[PDB]
Every structure is written in C-alpha cells, then in structure tokens.
C-alpha cells in the first residue's frame, strides 16, 4: 500500500463525497456467459474505493464466455464472504440456461442472496436469480428475448432498462450492465462519486446507429433477431416451467 | 461444428447481409489495462460471425486488470498471425505506460500495424499506437486526461469520441469502445449487420446522470479529475517527448 498514499486535492467542494467504503461485491462468472454482461458492471463497481470484488464460479479454473474470451474466477462458492453488500450474475444464452439449472450453483445463488444487501443481475442473468428463487414478488428486467419467461420464476417481468424493487435491481439486455453499474455506485456512495466514475469512464454515448431498442430499430432487424435467439427464447420458457 | 448448422431463417429482406467474414483481429491485453477498454470491442467484434479473434500478450501469462480482474491471453507476439484485419490496443494508466515503453510490445505493434487493413486503439490505448510509430500524421483520439500527448508521437490531437483516419481508427475514454465498435462492425460488414449486433447488445443508452464529457460535468467533478489525474497526465506527456 506505499501507494496510495493519500488522494490528491479533490478541492473544497469534495471534502463530503464518500471516497471510502468497504463494500463486498460477489459477481458470477460461469462458461458462455456473455462478458460485456460482466465487465460493464464491473468498470462501474471497480471504481469504489475501498471495496472487495470477488470474480466467484464453481471452481477456480478460467472460463471462457460467448465469444471466447477467458476470464479466472478469484473465488468459488466455498470461499466467496457469507454476507455479501453485492451479489451479481451476468447473463448469455446456453452458458447461463446451463449456470440456472446447476443444482450447486442455485444453492450458492440462494444461500448468498438470503443474506445480500443488494440482489442483481444484468441481461439474462436475471433467470439466474429466478431460478435460485430470488424474485418471488419482485418487479424485474431481462434481454428483451427471455424477458417474459421471469413470470415463471414468481417475478413480475417488467420492461425498463434498469428496474429496481426494494433490493433487487436488474439491468436490460448487455450494455444495460453500464446504466445499471453507474447507479448502483450512486446508490452505494453519492451521486458526485458517480459522477467522478461517468467522467472518467467518460460515459457520454453516442452510438452510430439507432437500433438499440425494439422500438426504434428497422422492422427487417427487429424480425431478423426475434428469428435468431427463438430458440433461446423457447428454452428460456420452458426453464421457467412454461 | 455440428452446431450452428444453418442459421435461422432471417426474412426476405436479409439476403444479401455479409452474414459471414474472415476478419483476422488481434487485440493486445497487458498488465493494468482497463478491461472496459478490451471488453466493449470485444463485445462488438465478438459478434462478426467467422472472424477469428486473438488475446495477444507477451506470454500466455493471465493478466490482471487495473481492477483485479484477469484475462487468458490466446497468443503471444510470436504466435499471433503476421497479416491482421484488425490490430488494436486499449487503453489504462500506469500499465499502459508500461507496455508504451517496453520494447517487444512496441516492436510487436509496429510490425503487424505495418500490414494490418486496419489500426486501432481504445482510450489511452493510442499512447500504445503512438509510441509504436503509428500515429505518424494522423489525426487520433484518446482518454481525455493524456489525448495532448498524442502530438509527441507525430499525432494530431483531435477531440472526438471516435475519429478515422484512412485506416486510423481510435475511440476516446474507457466506454467509447462500443460506439467504436460498432460503427467497426458497420465498416467490417454493413450497417444492416451493426443494427442487428446493436438491438442483440441492446445498446440504447440511459446514463443515469449527464457527467460524461468534459462539457456537462458538474465544474467541480471536472476539476477534482483532472486532479486526480495529473500524475497520468504528466506520465503521458513525458512518455510522448515533452
């Protein structure tokens, strides 16, 4: 720790901000998960000052997500903290219908979340937290493509980027994971401490194209895509007892 | 390969979409990147079908991000394919000026930049592409706490969240990847192809709060970072000549 030593001159204005915590963030990792779905949130969580992220999987050895990116866990559901500020689960497509249907990884699931601060989850990781029976009663979001299949898992599907009820809070599909991230860090220090991280990570988007939402990309897309993750949407249902 | 076998039906208007690519991209990860900057490309260039992706490190060796998470590398500057589609860098602080100032990584970078169809580089990542020697003459981009320093390296220093430059592409701080990615999609193949990765990411961005550029963030958030990062800001400049 000879570095940091001590914060450079925030300036007058900064001297309430809540640069310190300690918090403890427990984030899922599992084979085919989607990785933006955990790195989003992580650029965000990352920038708390003070507190612990555990990269938790079954076992230790590295996973490769959708694309082929290979992450290593840090910890594995017998040595990640008992009470956490933070359980997360990111999503994916088989990867994550896979993590919802490990019996040792809903049992983690379950036990970390009936003791959690905060319950969440970005994109499909939402079934996650379904499955490990976490939304009984709780308003949440998802990808658009399995978004509905929550309501077999007792939640009330609800279609927002960002949603939260009471302490869970949920993303939308992948890049919703920076929305959700960059509130949760006001949720856990203040809204000038978010602000810093948006600043930094500068999180003003301009995205090329304007097909980030089904209402507002072509028909041709919007159909062409609803045809692609079918399958996914079908296998989703029917994991929610549909 | 038995899986995918044929892709799904996408409707009589998708015929003609450049559906499959051999894109060769190789993107080089290193000690204290900031993932971020590695992961909202990924996300973007993950979604070319038939492209062949590389993690290049100077060993296999996983890497640890500035926020402790680490990545597998997949090939090291010896087994990375010597005629790229793409080469990019992303971007950090210290380990960023670690890997501008080692040279293997650089004579790694000048070689393949000297035939790749495309150089490109995330946030501080163009310090990398600089110190390499290929920003000689053109204009580029960068984080916006060393984006100056890029004129040290023969660069032309412009403030945008994505400039090209014939086949010169860079994207500003840490979340510019993914509008960088995805206009890299539209180049790579069409822009029909993009809005279909961009409606898959669901990238239609809420920020919570409007402190993302220099230009809406409170002048009290801007001042304590540009505080915070004079040391980077400084290291920059020194590393670039000045």
């Given at each position: 720790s000879l570095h940091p030593h001590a914060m450079p001159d925030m300036g007058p204005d900064m001297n309430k901000v809540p640069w310190m915590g300690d918090e403890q963030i427990a984030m899922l990792v599992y084979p085919g998960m989607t990785v933006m779905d955990l790195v989003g949130p992580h650029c965000m969580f990352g920038s708390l000052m003070g507190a612990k992220i555990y990269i938790v999987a079954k076992s230790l050895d590295p996973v490769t997500s959708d694309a082929g990116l290979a992450i290593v866990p840090t910890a594995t559901f017998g040595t990640c903290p008992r009470d956490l500020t933070v359980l997360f689960a990111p999503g994916g497509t088989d990867g994550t219908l896979a993590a919802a249907s490990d019996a040792e990884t809903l049992a983690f699931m379950a036990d970390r979340g009936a003791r959690a601060?905060?319950?969440?989850?970005v994109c499909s990781g939402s079934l996650i937290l379904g499955a490990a029976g976490l939304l009984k009663g709780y308003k949440a979001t998802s990808h658009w493509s399995c978004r509905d299949a929550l309501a077999g898992?007792?939640?009330?599907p609800t279609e927002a980027r960002?949603?939260?009820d009471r302490n869970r809070?949920?993303?939308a599909?992948?890049?919703?994971?920076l929305d959700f991230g960059l509130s949760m860090v006001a949720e856990l220090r203040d809204q000038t401490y978010a602000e810093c991280a948006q600043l930094?990570?500068?999180y003003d988007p301009d995205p090329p194209f304007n097909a980030g939402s089904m209402k507002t990309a072509p028909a041709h897309v919007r159909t062409a895509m609803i045809e692609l993750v079918a399958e996914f949407t079908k296998?989703?249902?029917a994991l929610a007892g549909f």
């Open positions: 601060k905060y319950i969440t989850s898992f007792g939640a009330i960002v949603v939260r809070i949920t993303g599909g992948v890049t919703a994971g930094m990570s500068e296998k989703a249902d």
